[PDB]
Amino acid sequence: GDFVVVYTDGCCSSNGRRRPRAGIGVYWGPGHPLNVGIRLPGRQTNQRAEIHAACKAIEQAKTQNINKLVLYTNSMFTINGITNWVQGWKKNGWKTSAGKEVINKEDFVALERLTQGMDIQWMHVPGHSGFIGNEEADRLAREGAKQSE
RNA sequence: UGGCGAGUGGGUGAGUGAGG
RNA sequence: CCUCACUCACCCACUCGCCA
């Protein structure tokens, strides 16, 4: 009704190896025309793919005039980054607790921008758990990673 | 004082490669 | 699902360093 459920995933074959390929998947439901599986731009890593899958879902929601989302992801790094860490980063100059610069600053800046004006329930997909929407987003992400950058 | 680096302990969750 | 080998990057504490 009021909120719309979306599943997101970012994947990266060869994460940490010499030829990484990162993809994003966004799943709105069976046959939904906004389902996407696309290649990630920029540095090819799992963490950026997980962040940008969430960004893509929010961007798409705004094109549909949706401002209330239930956004699933398996990435607690993405969830805790956007719900807890970016507030402190804006306040301290984007330094980690170890005193180093946040590596994916520009990705979290992009995500934070996209969350303005949105009500999002950020939902962690529990390990295993048989959520078909999560497996569908994962398959879309793997399709995207096979596409050209 | 201001910049970096390599590690250790404890956490949070992910992404892989070779196999079977 | 299992084995072996990994990174991605955050939250919190620490250690030893390099530079000006």
Short mmCIF file of C-alpha atoms (C1' of nucleotides) in Angstrom, two decimals:
data_model
loop_
_atom_site.label_atom_id
_atom_site.label_comp_id
_atom_site.label_asym_id
_atom_site.label_seq_id
_atom_site.Cartn_x
_atom_site.Cartn_y
_atom_site.Cartn_z
CA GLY A 1 0.00 0.00 0.00
CA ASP A 2 1.74 3.10 1.35
CA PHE A 3 5.24 1.56 1.20
CA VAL A 4 6.70 -0.38 -1.72
CA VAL A 5 9.07 -3.36 -1.24
CA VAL A 6 12.26 -3.61 -3.31
CA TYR A 7 15.16 -6.07 -3.16
CA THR A 8 18.68 -4.96 -4.07
CA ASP A 9 22.00 -6.68 -4.42
CA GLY A 10 25.52 -5.87 -5.49
CA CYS A 11 27.93 -8.63 -6.58
CA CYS A 12 31.57 -8.66 -7.75
CA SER A 13 33.21 -11.68 -9.34
CA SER A 14 36.97 -11.72 -8.65
CA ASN A 15 36.53 -9.30 -5.71
CA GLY A 16 40.05 -8.51 -4.57
CA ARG A 17 41.59 -10.23 -7.64
CA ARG A 18 43.10 -8.79 -10.83
CA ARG A 19 39.94 -8.72 -13.01
CA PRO A 20 36.93 -7.88 -10.82
CA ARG A 21 33.48 -7.49 -12.43
CA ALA A 22 30.78 -5.79 -10.33
CA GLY A 23 27.03 -5.73 -11.02
CA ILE A 24 23.86 -4.38 -9.45
CA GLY A 25 20.43 -5.95 -9.32
CA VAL A 26 17.15 -4.30 -8.34
CA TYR A 27 14.01 -6.43 -8.13
CA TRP A 28 10.51 -4.94 -7.78
CA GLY A 29 8.56 -8.16 -8.40
CA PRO A 30 7.89 -10.78 -11.09
CA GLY A 31 7.75 -9.20 -14.54
CA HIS A 32 8.07 -5.65 -13.21
CA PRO A 33 9.49 -3.42 -16.00
CA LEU A 34 11.80 -1.61 -13.59
CA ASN A 35 13.76 -4.74 -12.68
CA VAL A 36 17.38 -4.10 -13.68
CA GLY A 37 20.70 -5.93 -13.80
CA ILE A 38 23.46 -3.60 -14.89
CA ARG A 39 27.23 -3.18 -14.70
CA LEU A 40 28.64 -1.04 -11.92
CA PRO A 41 30.61 2.06 -13.01
CA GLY A 42 33.91 2.99 -11.41
CA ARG A 43 36.01 0.89 -9.06
CA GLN A 44 34.83 -2.72 -9.29
CA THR A 45 34.20 -3.92 -5.71
CA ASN A 46 31.52 -5.71 -3.75
CA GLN A 47 30.97 -2.86 -1.28
CA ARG A 48 30.41 -0.25 -4.00
CA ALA A 49 28.10 -2.59 -5.83
CA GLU A 50 25.96 -3.09 -2.70
CA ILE A 51 25.78 0.67 -2.11
CA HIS A 52 24.91 1.45 -5.72
CA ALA A 53 22.21 -1.19 -5.95
CA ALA A 54 20.43 0.64 -3.14
CA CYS A 55 21.03 3.99 -4.89
CA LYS A 56 19.54 2.69 -8.13
CA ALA A 57 16.41 1.48 -6.34
CA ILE A 58 15.91 4.90 -4.70
CA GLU A 59 16.54 6.72 -7.99
CA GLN A 60 13.95 4.48 -9.69
CA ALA A 61 11.47 5.04 -6.88
CA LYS A 62 11.69 8.80 -7.37
CA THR A 63 10.97 8.41 -11.10
CA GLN A 64 7.75 6.61 -10.05
CA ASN A 65 6.87 9.27 -7.45
CA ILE A 66 7.45 6.71 -4.66
CA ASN A 67 8.80 8.26 -1.47
CA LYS A 68 8.20 5.28 0.89
CA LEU A 69 10.34 2.17 0.40
CA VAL A 70 11.07 -1.06 2.19
CA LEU A 71 14.59 -1.66 0.87
CA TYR A 72 16.15 -5.11 1.34
CA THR A 73 19.89 -5.71 1.10
CA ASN A 74 22.26 -8.29 2.60
CA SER A 75 24.86 -5.57 3.16
CA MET A 76 25.04 -4.43 6.79
CA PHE A 77 27.91 -2.20 5.68
CA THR A 78 25.46 -0.34 3.44
CA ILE A 79 22.71 -0.23 6.06
CA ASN A 80 24.88 0.87 8.96
CA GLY A 81 26.72 3.32 6.71
CA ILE A 82 23.56 5.11 5.64
CA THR A 83 21.66 4.90 8.93
CA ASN A 84 24.53 5.44 11.42
CA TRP A 85 27.93 6.32 10.01
CA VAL A 86 27.35 9.07 7.44
CA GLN A 87 25.96 11.43 10.09
CA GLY A 88 29.20 11.24 12.04
CA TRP A 89 31.26 11.43 8.85
CA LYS A 90 29.63 14.69 7.76
CA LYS A 91 30.46 16.01 11.23
CA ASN A 92 34.10 14.87 11.42
CA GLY A 93 35.42 15.28 7.87
CA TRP A 94 34.78 11.70 6.71
CA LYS A 95 37.30 9.94 8.95
CA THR A 96 36.97 6.35 10.05
CA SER A 97 37.43 5.40 13.66
CA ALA A 98 41.05 4.50 12.74
CA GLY A 99 41.56 8.05 11.50
CA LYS A 100 41.76 7.27 7.80
CA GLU A 101 39.69 8.66 4.96
CA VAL A 102 36.46 6.82 4.12
CA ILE A 103 37.34 5.02 0.92
CA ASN A 104 33.85 5.05 -0.63
CA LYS A 105 33.01 8.62 0.50
CA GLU A 106 31.64 9.63 -2.89
CA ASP A 107 29.32 6.61 -2.97
CA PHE A 108 27.95 7.33 0.48
CA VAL A 109 27.56 11.04 -0.50
CA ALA A 110 25.50 9.89 -3.48
CA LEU A 111 23.39 7.53 -1.36
CA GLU A 112 22.83 10.15 1.33
CA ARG A 113 21.64 12.62 -1.31
CA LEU A 114 19.22 10.09 -2.76
CA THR A 115 17.75 9.33 0.69
CA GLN A 116 16.72 12.98 1.19
CA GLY A 117 12.98 13.26 0.90
CA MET A 118 12.47 9.48 1.29
CA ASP A 119 11.08 7.34 4.11
CA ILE A 120 13.07 4.08 3.92
CA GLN A 121 12.78 1.00 6.08
CA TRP A 122 16.27 -0.47 5.59
CA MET A 123 15.90 -4.25 5.94
CA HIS A 124 18.74 -6.72 6.27
CA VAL A 125 18.10 -9.94 4.33
CA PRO A 126 18.94 -12.66 6.89
CA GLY A 127 21.46 -15.28 5.82
CA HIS A 128 19.69 -18.17 4.03
CA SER A 129 15.96 -17.58 4.80
CA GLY A 130 14.45 -18.38 1.41
CA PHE A 131 13.46 -14.86 0.38
CA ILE A 132 12.78 -15.27 -3.37
CA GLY A 133 13.06 -11.51 -3.89
CA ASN A 134 16.64 -11.65 -2.65
CA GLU A 135 17.57 -14.51 -5.00
CA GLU A 136 15.99 -12.61 -7.91
CA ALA A 137 18.02 -9.45 -7.14
CA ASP A 138 21.17 -11.58 -6.86
CA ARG A 139 20.53 -13.12 -10.28
CA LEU A 140 20.02 -9.69 -11.83
CA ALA A 141 23.26 -8.45 -10.30
CA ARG A 142 25.16 -11.37 -11.81
CA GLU A 143 23.65 -10.52 -15.23
CA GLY A 144 24.87 -6.93 -14.84
CA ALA A 145 28.41 -7.95 -13.95
CA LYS A 146 28.67 -9.75 -17.31
CA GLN A 147 27.88 -6.51 -19.19
CA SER A 148 30.48 -4.02 -20.41
CA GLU A 149 31.67 -1.16 -18.20
"C1'" U B 1 52.66 18.91 15.44
"C1'" G B 2 50.98 17.40 10.49
"C1'" G B 3 50.82 13.29 6.91
"C1'" C B 4 51.28 8.02 5.76
"C1'" G B 5 52.25 2.49 6.45
"C1'" A B 6 52.28 -2.36 8.47
"C1'" G B 7 50.18 -5.32 12.21
"C1'" U B 8 47.42 -7.30 16.82
"C1'" G B 9 42.76 -8.11 19.77
"C1'" G B 10 37.63 -7.70 19.64
"C1'" G B 11 33.19 -6.80 16.34
"C1'" U B 12 29.61 -6.14 11.82
"C1'" G B 13 28.09 -7.94 7.36
"C1'" A B 14 29.27 -9.06 2.56
"C1'" G B 15 32.07 -10.43 -2.20
"C1'" U B 16 35.26 -14.21 -4.30
"C1'" G B 17 39.06 -18.04 -6.58
"C1'" A B 18 40.39 -23.25 -7.16
"C1'" G B 19 38.25 -27.75 -6.08
"C1'" G B 20 34.28 -31.80 -5.04
"C1'" C C 1 26.65 -27.75 1.05
"C1'" C C 2 31.86 -29.04 2.29
"C1'" U C 3 37.44 -28.18 1.63
"C1'" C C 4 41.51 -25.10 0.70
"C1'" A C 5 43.15 -19.94 -0.57
"C1'" C C 6 41.66 -14.62 -0.44
"C1'" U C 7 39.51 -9.16 -0.30
"C1'" C C 8 35.91 -5.46 0.57
"C1'" A C 9 35.52 -1.92 4.49
"C1'" C C 10 33.18 -0.29 8.31
"C1'" C C 11 33.10 -0.01 14.41
"C1'" C C 12 35.97 0.16 18.75
"C1'" A C 13 40.71 -0.52 21.29
"C1'" C C 14 45.95 -1.22 20.85
"C1'" U C 15 51.44 -1.97 18.91
"C1'" C C 16 55.43 -1.06 16.09
"C1'" G C 17 57.02 2.05 12.38
"C1'" C C 18 58.11 5.72 7.97
"C1'" C C 19 57.97 10.89 6.34
"C1'" A C 20 58.10 16.46 6.78
#
